[PDB]
Structure 1
């Protein structure tokens, strides 16, 4: 949960604090896709186990 997946930081708070609405949406989308991929990989390994 500390990776940033090609964004400027992994914290949502400090990129909502200093970036601006559509740039903030652009970074937050990358964070959202990375965390969804993490959850997908966890669920797939749980199914095989």
Structure 2
């Protein structure tokens, strides 16, 4: 929970913690986007058919 990290740590290490969280969530978003892109290619092929 980002709010807990902001409420429990000062910026010097809150920045590291939020950096880890941001990296994880960005990786999840990129994975989801790639999955969506591949499935959209599938659906485009089916739509052309």
The normalised TM-score by structure 1 is 0.73
The normalised TM-score by structure 2 is 0.73
Give the C-alpha shift of residue 22 in structure 1. 1.1
Give the C-alpha shift of residue 30 in structure 1. 0.4
RMSD of the alignment, in Å? 0.7
Q: Which runs of 5+ in 2 are unaligned?
A: 40-49
Length, aligned pairs only: 39
Question: Relative contact order, CA 8 A, sep 6+: which one is greater?
Answer: 1
Moved over 3 A (4+): none
